[PDB]
Amino acid sequence: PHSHPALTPEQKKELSDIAHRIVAPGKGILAADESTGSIAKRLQSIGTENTEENRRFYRQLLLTADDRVNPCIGGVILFHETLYQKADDGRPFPQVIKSKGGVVGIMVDKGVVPLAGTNGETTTQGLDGLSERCAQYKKDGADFAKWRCVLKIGEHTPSALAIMENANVLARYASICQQNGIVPIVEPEILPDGDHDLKRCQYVTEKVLAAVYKALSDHHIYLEGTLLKPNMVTPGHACTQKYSHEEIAMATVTALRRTVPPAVTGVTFLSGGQSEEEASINLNAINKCPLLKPWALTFSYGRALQASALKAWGGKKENLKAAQEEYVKRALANSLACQGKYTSSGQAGAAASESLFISNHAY
Amino acid sequence: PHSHPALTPEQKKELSDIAHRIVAPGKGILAADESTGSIAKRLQSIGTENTEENRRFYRQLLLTADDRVNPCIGGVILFHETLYQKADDGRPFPQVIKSKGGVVGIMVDKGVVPLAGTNGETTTQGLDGLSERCAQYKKDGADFAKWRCVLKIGEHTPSALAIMENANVLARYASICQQNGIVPIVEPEILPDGDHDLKRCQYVTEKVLAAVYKALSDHHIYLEGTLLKPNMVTPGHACTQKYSHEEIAMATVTALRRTVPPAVTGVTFLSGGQSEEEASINLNAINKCPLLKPWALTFSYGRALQASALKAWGGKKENLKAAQEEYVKRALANSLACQGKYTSSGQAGAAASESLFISNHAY
Amino acid sequence: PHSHPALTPEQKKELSDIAHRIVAPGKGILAADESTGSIAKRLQSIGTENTEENRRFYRQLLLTADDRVNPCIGGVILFHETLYQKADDGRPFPQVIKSKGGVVGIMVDKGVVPLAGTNGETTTQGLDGLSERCAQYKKDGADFAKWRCVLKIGEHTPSALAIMENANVLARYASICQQNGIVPIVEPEILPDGDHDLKRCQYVTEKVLAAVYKALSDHHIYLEGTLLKPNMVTPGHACTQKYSHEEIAMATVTALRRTVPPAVTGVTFLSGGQSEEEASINLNAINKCPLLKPWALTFSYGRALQASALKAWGGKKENLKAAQEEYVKRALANSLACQGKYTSSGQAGAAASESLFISNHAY
Amino acid sequence: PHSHPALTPEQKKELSDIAHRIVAPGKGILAADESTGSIAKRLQSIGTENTEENRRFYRQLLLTADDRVNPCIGGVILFHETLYQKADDGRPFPQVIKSKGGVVGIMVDKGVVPLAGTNGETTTQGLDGLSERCAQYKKDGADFAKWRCVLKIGEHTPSALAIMENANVLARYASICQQNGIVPIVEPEILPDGDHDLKRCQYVTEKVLAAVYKALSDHHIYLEGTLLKPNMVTPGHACTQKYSHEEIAMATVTALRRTVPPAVTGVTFLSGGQSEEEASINLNAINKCPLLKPWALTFSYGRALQASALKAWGGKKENLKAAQEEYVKRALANSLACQGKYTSSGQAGAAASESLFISNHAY
């Protein structure tokens, strides 16, 4: 084949730098990119009703935590609106994040659309005018993007089509991102739904990440300028078998060692519906695993950094400080976790709510 | 693999029915899907302003030609605007087209975008929200769609990536279209720009189409409810070698025979810069080839059907009929060609001057 | 991509001719390429020891059937032993077959081997030193070869690995073949085992062939110099649903129309455990399907052309004439079948015999 | 996809162990797999006849080395003949190797065959009956195999086909090996021929490796029981650009980092026509490269470990020890190089190579 460099030595430089700053030792990613609909559900869980002001206030709450958070938070992924909102003192949100030492992230995909002829599988849209939006985003203080692709494990899922198609689109988004000085977080999300064991999930994970990286190679993606946001290898939510956090750290680290090349700056694990405590404990064991990890293994948590804070806040403006505290605790807990310096109480405790719902809550 | 029917027998029936109505014996397709920018170039050449009224009137001009055209036109591809425009009688253009026995088509892609790391190669965007647009377009009288993917021949083109990428986007588009009852026209266009000869073009056409069809298989596209709009195998527009139309017809038919499966209802060739007369002659000879053709071999012309009409229109009502007649002449000339009944007219007058470069100065 | 002529006009010529002559109207293929072990199993049934003499005589009994078979069979696939054997008159078997108007075939594959990591799947070996063997076979009067890959429909079969593998190995065998002036018959045999219905078989068959022809394209295969020896789309050998001959005919032709490009000279269906009469009846209805078939649709039968002959012989020389007749009559019946001119006393397809799997005993 | 364990936990364990022994810190591989034909040319340069004994004596010379190489040689690759030859003391060669601490290897490929339609490209044969060959070789002390694949760089090479095909064939060989408890060494040798620079080769290497690993994943290969035998990223032999060993080391490790998953136990580079010193120097620079190397970077040298010793022999049986010493020094030198503790420099001024191409004479 004949090379035709998509990026210049300088473009590659900026990309690597940004990536290495987000995953810097002890730092992780705050997933604050809940869409108006996602947040609407969560605000109502405490009794609060959805509204722009409430969203701004809530996001501010997380973003204006005391400086203890600074060494823990390497980046914050935001939703389109929050990016253009301002703190009570009139300082635009990206500036607050930036002054705290982090890089501003943006959710760029436009949701998942079904694939015809599949067993309910999907692909993700958002490629239209992506360049134009990536140009505005960076100009407005965005250094990285996030694009989510969902995969599901079943009797005949994920299919060859689902895997190859989803990989191919993630590769496209990534390519576009780099061209505009944007670092792309490739999120090949395999859903925990099902009763499949640890082996199945691990096996699936290996297969999908294979396709993912081969695709990136075909599309000429600069891996040093990318972050991987995969799922931790765990059993299905309906699996009757209990596994030790070590088995999870094992299955996870192994899948990665077999599919993720060293050039990848880092891996930011998603909480995937795990309780706050559990999320940190697993991330700890993953960094406590004897195997050789060529890249950072940190977090990119959403609910696993907001649960207790949301509850403690309860919409009560007076509860601002009490709510921010919970946020801070989880952040520090995970800061240690991505280093293997975390200690828990063998379970979960307060951070153990959530609850598994099977065909019960439509709303 | 495990089947999961994308379409029910009823959906397939409709699709196969529509695709058959467009490529019926002796009928072709009128491409009137120029966008505000494309049509502008054509209006300014004759001296007419690029106004909505002017575009509307010219579009009407062709869409209201005498009934002799009814048997020649199986479908008319319209641009979003023209689709929602009314004729002087207050009737919506689609109703006007379908009353005259024509099937209404719509252009749904959003243009070509660069592929990073390639040699000026591209891909096509437009998939975002396509289902909602296709579902709605169906509600407004459009029965078929059109999507264009541009490929190019060069020292290192088309590349594996460009081929794989465009082939995949086309299959995505089709899948979506068929889910909304819309018949997809795959348009894997291989540009004639260059100095390459017949052999090379043919060779590339065979690879592009093989890839295109395998992609449709992976995507479970219903081949019976599809039309393939390709380029005719011709040498480059700078090649130094005269080729008889017979050779062109041989190379073209051979290429299609090697890659386009029989189930494909019809092939609608595009002019691609050929003179009106040349488009008719090559299409005529294609149909005259001794090789077995298990699919309709007709046209889908733009400039090759409109060239003389635009010129004979002058941009004023006075030449309304004078122009319509040129269009009528060209269509029935091509109507005969897609059956092997056309007989070369010759060359003497009423030709079209596509841009003034080395002519006149003070007129 | 760029061209590098795999074959020259003269080579393409020779191949196209050889292939067309074998599938000439009314003509089919006799598949007597049973390996020493395979034939031993058949001889054991009639009470005849597996002696090279016995093998030579039986093969002779088939090849020396009077001139009535001449217009019926255009090709004879032999085993390495048979190719070098001589008939009673001292003339070599290929000369015998040749004088009778047929072209000699030879099996070249080395059997199937397991694909580790698959649900008991296989792939086929035989590529090592193939070129050398093909050059020898050619010098010895062999003008076409046979390579068989086995695939199976089941719970998680056939898988992507198997499909990709066999499709690719066939293309290797094919390419080599064309280089040595041998016409390759590509045989992607999908076993009829299992309780899978007709629709399942059609789907898998469609997908397998789509992979096959994409593979041939990648390897630059000359489709006009190739034959396809597929399985008919029939229900599983344990299906409880009863199907008519017209249904299997429609399913087989539809599948083919969706995968086999017009350029492919001919399709030589295999028996696949079908009865002698059932095979010919199915072949006939297939050629009586209203759907346009761009290529020849003949047979390449083994047991479906030998059973009665082999059975009547009983290892007794004096039964020679009776045995050969059972054969001649079988060839004659199929000769009409490939032309769609086969009708038994009743002007309808004969009813089945056992059909146990449809009875109440299969519940 | 669905998990179907190709190897039991103990099978994986055996492979991991073998592969790890071969590339333990400080150890490398001795490449003595020169076929009878190839070894002949070498013997001709030292005025020696290529006979049964002469070859055996030469192989003995290397294998019956002073125990000082015991910590240097992790494994030795033998040709089929040598595997069944015995040393003067009456011990079969594989016995000598084992006792001295090294694991016995055997190259199993049967040479390269031309790919049709390509610009003189190739693929490798050897898969036929490979399984039974492995079961026997294993029986006779073999623990690891070798299969070479050649890919040349040029105007349009390597092609997508050569990459796809060679990758698939390497994976087929790998699978068959692991099935018989043999560690397979994947060798996609990218020829250094031509005037292409450093960047072109790195690019091609990245592409080739990307395909190799995807194919291994598709075939369900156990990465922990495999070794890659790639070329170092070095410019073309006809290139006219001076590159320091530091530039070579950088380009090389980065390529592996972007493709080779950390699970790959080790990488045993090949000399690629390099001189003994140059190979030791480049390997040293490669190991002392600042970037994180998750796999063992060692050697597997033929000429670069025999050159001087071979010359010293010059047929004279007396020269035995003097020649054996030159080999010991080379082994020790490289033993230090595979750890990045080798005193050197490398300047094309004193002891230079064919620097003619860089010379003004090449203008």
Asked if A8 reaches chain B (Cβ–Cβ under 8 Å), the answer is: no
- Domain assignments of chain B as residue spans, ordered by start: 1-363
Q: Of chain C residues 50-109, which have a CB less than 8 A from chain B?
A: none
Write down the residue that tokens 């898998």 correspond to.
Answer: C204
Query: Any bridge partners for residue B183, and if so which?
Result: B144
Q: Chains that contact B by 3+ CB pairs under 8 Å?
A: A, C
From the centroid of its chain, how far is CA D38?
Answer: 16
B8–chain A Cβ distance below 8 A for any pair = no
CATH value of C1-363 in 3.40.50.2300, 3.40.50.150, 3.20.20.70, 3.40.50.720? 3.20.20.70
Task: Using alpha carbons, select from C123, C151, C115, A292 the residue that is nearest to residue D178.
Answer: C115
Determine whether B65 is exposed, middle or buried from the number of CB atoms within 10 Å of its CB (0-12, 13-18, 19+).
buried
The tokens describing C328, both together, are 């001649």
Residue B87, Cβ density class (10 Å: 0-12 exposed, 13-18 middle, ≥19 buried): middle
Take residue B23 and report the two structure tokens written for it: 């490529």
* Sequence-distant (≥ 6) Cβ neighbours of residue C4 within 8 angstroms: D117, D118, D119
Q: Point out which residues pair with C154 in neighbouring strands.
A: C157
- Nearest residue to A142 via CA among A96, A104, A196: A104
Residue D131 to residue D137: CA distance in whole angstroms: 10
Residues of chain C positioned with their CB less than 8 A from the CB of D117: 3-6, 175, 219-220
β strands within chain D, DSSP E: 28-32, 73-78, 103-107, 112-114, 122-124, 144-151, 183-190, 227-228, 266-269, 296-301
For D310-334, give one letter per residue: b (16+ CB within 10 A) or e: bebbeeeeebeeebbbbbbebbbbb
Q: Given the residues C229, C276, C278, C326, select the one marked as catalytic.
A: C229
Q: For residue C288, which amino acid is it?
A: K
- Cα D219-D224-D229 angle, rounded to 5 deg: 80
Q: Is the peptide bond before A188 cis (omega within 30 degrees of 0)?
A: no
**Can you tell me the distance from the alpha carbon of B77 to that of B103, in angstroms, rounded to the nearest whole number?**
9
DSSP A294: S
Nearest Cα of chain C lies from the Cα of D279 at a distance, in angstroms, of 34
Interchain proximity C117–D179, CB inside 8 Å = no
Q: Is A187 a catalytic residue?
A: yes
> Is residue C288 exposed (0-12), middle (13-18) or buried (19+ Cβ within 10 Å)?
middle
Q: How far is B279 from chain C (nearest CA, A)?
A: 25
What gap in Å lies between CA B355 and CA D276, rounded to an integer? 67
Instruction: Give the separation between CA C347 and CA C344, rounded to whole angstroms.
Output: 6
**Greatest pairwise CA separation for chain A in angstroms:** 63
- Whether omega before A235 lies within 30 degrees of 0, making that bond cis, reads no
**How far, in Å, CA of D205 to CA of D189, rounded?**
9
At C317, is the secondary structure helix, strand, or coil? Answer: helix
B132 touches chain A (CB under 8 A): no
**Which residue matches tokens 């992924």?**
A77
Count of positions (residues) in chain B? 363
Check if the beta carbon of residue D259 is closer than 8 Å to that of residue D311: no
Tokens of A240: 């009757």
Query: What is the SS3 assignment for D34?
Result: coil
Number of neighbours of residue B316 by Cβ within 10 angstroms: 12
∠ CA B215-B221-B223, nearest 5°, is: 100
Q: Is B262 an 8 Å CB contact of chain C?
A: yes
Query: Which amino acid is it at A343?
Result: T
Q: How far is CA B98 from CA B76, C82, D183, in A?
A: 9, 67, 69
Helix ranges restricted to H, A270-338: 276-288, 307-313, 320-337
Asked if D174 and D184 touch (Cβ cutoff 8 Å), the reply is yes
Of A282, A310, A311, A309, give the one whose Cα is nearest residue A298.
A282
Non-local (6+) Cβ contacts of C206 within 8 A are: B217, C255, C258, C259
Single-letter amino acid code for the residue at C44: Q
d(CA A4, CA B156): 10
| Sequence-distant (≥ 6) Cβ neighbours of residue C149 within 8 angstroms | C112, C122, C123, C124, C166, C169, C170, C187, C188, C189
Q: What's the maximum distance between 2 C-alpha atoms anywhere in chain B?
A: 71
Reduced to 3 states, what is the DSSP secondary structure of residue C352? coil
- Cα separation of B354 and D130, whole Å? 66
Q: Is B176 on the interface with A (CB under 8 A)?
A: yes
Quick one: tokens of C333? 């019946």
What residues does A31 pair with on adjacent strands?
Answer: A77
Residue D134 token pair: 């492995």
CB atoms within 10 A of CB C139: 9
- Residue B124 parent element (H or E): strand B122-124
Helix (H) or strand (E) holding A298, with range, is strand A296-301
Radius of gyration of chain D from Cα atoms?
20
**Residue whose entry in the numeric block shows the structure tokens 């810190």:** D25
Q: What is the C-alpha to C-alpha distance for residues B146 and B270, in angstroms, rounded to an integer?
A: 12
Q: In angstroms, what CA-CA distances link D114 with C221, C222, D151, D313? A: 15, 17, 11, 37
The torsion angles phi and psi of C151, rounded to 5 degrees, stand at: -135, 155
Tell if the CB–CB gap between B254 and C261 is shorter than 8 Å: no
Helix (H, G, I), strand (E, B) or coil at B149: strand
Give the sign of the dihedral formed by CA D241, CA D246, CA D249, CA D254.
negative
Tokens 């990591």 found at: C117
Among the partner-chain residues C2, C116, C125, the one whose CB lies closest to the CB of D175 is C116
Distance separating alpha carbons of residues A114 and A123, to the nearest angstrom? 6
Is B261 within 8 Å of C263 when comparing Cβ atoms?
no
Q: At what angle do helices C160-179 and D160-178 cross, to 10 degrees?
A: 120
Long-range contacts of A239-243 (CB under 8 A, 24+ apart): A239/A194, A239/A195, A239/A196, A239/A197, A240/A195, A241/A197, A241/A198, A243/A198
| Parallel/antiparallel/unpaired status of strands A144-151 and A266-269 | unpaired
Q: Which residues of D210-237 are buried (b: 16+ CB within 10 A; e: fewer)?
A: bbbbbbbbbbbbbbbbbbbbbbbbbbbb
Element containing residue C160 per DSSP (H, E): helix C160-179
Chain mean position to CA A238: 23
3-state secondary structure (DSSP) of residue D123: strand
Q: Which pair of tokens denotes residue A267?
A: 């891996």
Q: Are D189 and D204 in contact (CB under 8 A)?
A: no
Q: Measuring CA to CA, which residue among C31, C6, C33, C29 is closest to residue C181?
A: C6
Backbone angles phi, psi at C123, to 5 degrees: -150, 175
Q: Report whether D306 contacts D269 (CB < 8 A).
A: no
Strand C266-269 versus strand C296-301 pairing type: parallel
The first and second tokens of residue B343, run together, are 């007989």
Q: Decide: D216 and D186 in contact? Cβ < 8 Å.
A: yes
Dist. CA A143–CA A104, nearest whole Å = 6
Q: Tell whether the torsion through CA atoms of C158, C160, C161 and C167 is positive or negative.
A: positive
CB atoms near residue A13 (< 10 Å): 13
Q: The dihedral of CA B331, B332, B336, B339: what is its sign?
A: positive
Tell me how far apart the alpha carbons of residues D170 and D211 are, in angstroms, rounded to a whole number: 11
Between the CA atoms of B146, B152, B157 and B158, what dihedral angle is there, to the nearest 10 degrees? 20
**β-bridge partners, D188:** D149
DSSP C68: T
Strand (E) or helix (H) holding D255: helix D245-257
Count of positions (residues) in chain A: 363
Q: For B144, how many CA atoms within 13 A lie in the half-sphere containing its CB?
A: 34
Alpha-carbon torsion B75, B78, B84, B85, what sign? negative
What single letter denotes the amino acid at residue D115?
Answer: L
Are the C-beta atoms of D298 and D271 separated by less than 8 Å? Answer: no
Q: How far apart are CA A98 and CA D12, in angstroms?
A: 48
CA angle, D31 then D37 then D39, to 5°: 40
Largest CA distance in chain D: 63
Helix, coil or strand: residue B112: strand
Residues of D in contact with A204 (CB under 8 A): 1
- Any B CB within 8 A of A157 CB: no
Nearest alpha-carbon partner for C174 in C187, C161, C165, C191: C187
Q: Where are the alpha helices (DSSP H) in C190-275?
A: 198-218, 245-257
CB count within 10 Å of CB C48 equals 20
User: DSSP assignment of A52-96, as one string?
Assistant: HHHHHHHHHHHHT--GGGTTTEEEEEE-HHHHT-B-TTS-BHHHH
Element (H, E) at C176: helix C160-179
Contact B108, B146 (CB under 8 A): yes
Place of tokens 């689902």: A162
Could you give the C-alpha distances from D18 to A204, D13, D25, in angstroms and in order? 28, 9, 14
The answer to whether B155 and B148 have CB atoms below 8 angstroms apart is no
DSSP string covering A176-228: HHHHTT-EEEEEEEE---SS--HHHHHHHHHHHHHHHHHHHHHTT--GGG-EE
Report CA torsion sign: C207, C213, C217, C218.
positive
CA distance A188 to A151: 7
Return d(Cα C3, Cα C23) in angstroms, integer.
30
* φ and ψ at residue D193, rounded to 5 degrees: -65, 145
CB atoms within 10 A of CB A290: 8
Q: Is B229 a catalytic residue?
A: yes
Give the span between the Cα atoms of D294 and D246, in whole angstroms: 19
Of B34, B165, B187, B326, which residue is the catalytic one? Answer: B187
Q: Nearest-CA neighbor of A220 among A177, A269, A187?
A: A177
C165 interaction partners in chain D (CB closer than 8 Å): 168, 172
Q: How far apart are CA A31 and CA A48, in angstroms?
A: 21
What distance in Å separates the CA atoms of residue A326 and residue C144, rounded to the nearest whole number? 77
Q: Which position has the token pair 């004479």?
A: D361
SS3 A28: strand
Enclosing H/E stretch for C37:
helix C36-46
Q: Sign of the C-alpha dihedral, residues A222, A226, A230, A233?
A: positive
Q: What value, to the nearest 5°, has the Cα angle with vertex D32 and ends D29 and D33?
A: 110
* E strands, C71-182, in order: 73-78, 103-107, 112-114, 122-124, 142-152
CA A362 – CA A274 distance, rounded (Å) = 21
Both tokens assigned to B167? 């082939």
The DSSP-derived string for B2-37 is ----SS-HHHHHHHHHHHHHHS-TT-EEEEE---HH
Binding positions of C for beta-D-fructose 1,6-bisphosphate: 42, 271-273, 300, 303
Instruction: Please state at what angle helix D52-63 crosses helix D36-45, rounded to 10 degrees.
Output: 80
Dist CA B159 CA B154 (whole Å): 9
Structure tokens belonging to residue A40: 């609407």
* Pairing mode, strands D112-114 and D103-107: unpaired
Instruction: Determine the distance in angstroms separating the CA of D99 from the nearest CA of chain A, rounded to an integer.
Output: 31
Phi, psi of B293 (to 5 degrees): -115, 95
Contacting residues for B66 by C-beta, under 8 A, at least 6 apart: B324, B328
Q: Which two tokens stand for residue D279?
A: 């190979």
- Tokens read off for D162: 């050569």
**How many other C-beta atoms can be found within 10 angstroms of the C-beta atom of residue B344?**
13
Name the experimental technique: X-ray
Resolution (A): 2.5
Integer Cα distance of B63 and B96 in angstroms: 7
Instruction: Note if the bond before B158 is cis, omega within 30 degrees.
Output: yes
Q: Are C244 and C203 in contact (CB under 8 A)?
A: no
For C103, the enclosing helix (H) or strand (E) is strand C103-107
Residue where the block lists tokens 């190859």: A164
A30 touches chain D (CB under 8 A): no
Which residue in A216, A186, A259 sits closest to D261, CA to CA? A259
Residue D97 sits at φ, ψ, to 5 deg, of -55, -50
Question: Which of D276, D115, A28, B69 is closest to C176 using CA atoms?
Answer: D115
Tell me how far apart the terminal alpha carbons of chain A are, to the nearest angstrom: 53
